[PDB]
Amino acid sequence: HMQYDIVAVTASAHDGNLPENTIDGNLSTRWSANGSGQYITFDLGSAKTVNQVKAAWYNGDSRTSGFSISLGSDPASLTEVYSGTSSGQTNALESYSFTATTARYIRITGFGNSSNTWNSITEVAIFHAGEEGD
Ligand SMILES: [Ca+2]
């Protein structure tokens, strides 16, 4: 099981809740950007094998967020690997798994949530996960 270092984070926008708040280890700090289609981009610093992205959602136990995950070797050429909606059932890191593939950049695009148009993420982690489960 490998959790990759995130050397840099950028976003399409933020409201003062900075993109770097997603990699500070603190569920009490967040990235926020208002509107469907806002996004946050993680840099691993080099190409790695990735098969899982975890995101902890702001008010994640009270509302569902629509999102898509894309990845690739450069931000101008990303491919979608995952699309869905957060569970609405936890504030913890929630795992989004997909077929293992090479990426340096991971982008989460948000489509707002079940309460309002905000995209608010408290933590992200990027993995090469092995076999896991009860
Ligand atoms: Ca945080």
Stated resolution in angstroms: 1.7
CA of 16 to the centre of ligand 1 (A): 13
Chain-centroid distance, C-alpha 27: 14
Distance separating alpha carbons of residues 95 and 97, to the nearest angstrom: 6
> What Å distances lie between residue 1 and 5, 15, 16, 54, 91, CA to CA?
13, 34, 34, 13, 22
Q: Are 129 and 5 in contact (CB under 8 A)?
A: no
For residue 96, being part of any structural domain is answered with: yes
For residue 52, being part of any structural domain is answered with: yes
Q: Which CATH number covers residue 52?
A: 2.60.120.260
Q: Which distant-in-sequence residues (6+ apart) come within 8 Å of 54 by Cβ?
A: 93, 94, 95, 96, 123, 124, 125, 126, 127
CA of 60 to the centre of ligand 1 (A): 13
Please give the tally of structural domains in the chain.
1
> What Å distances lie between residue 93 and 18, 22, 43, 61, 111, CA to CA?
18, 11, 19, 11, 19
For residue 113, being part of any structural domain is answered with: yes
Q: Which distant-in-sequence residues (6+ apart) come within 8 Å of 67 by Cβ?
A: 55, 83, 84, 85, 86, 108, 109, 110, 111, 119
CA of 121 to the centre of ligand 1 (A): 7
For residue 2, being part of any structural domain is answered with: no
The residue to which tokens 């959602």 are assigned: 57
For residue 133, being part of any structural domain is answered with: no
CA of 82 to the centre of ligand 1 (A): 22
How many residues are present in the chain? 134
Instruction: State residue 61 phi and psi, 5-degree precision.
Output: -90, 5
For residue 43, being part of any structural domain is answered with: yes
- Give the Cα-Cα-Cα angle 81, 86, 90 (nearest 5 degrees): 135
Solving technique: X-ray
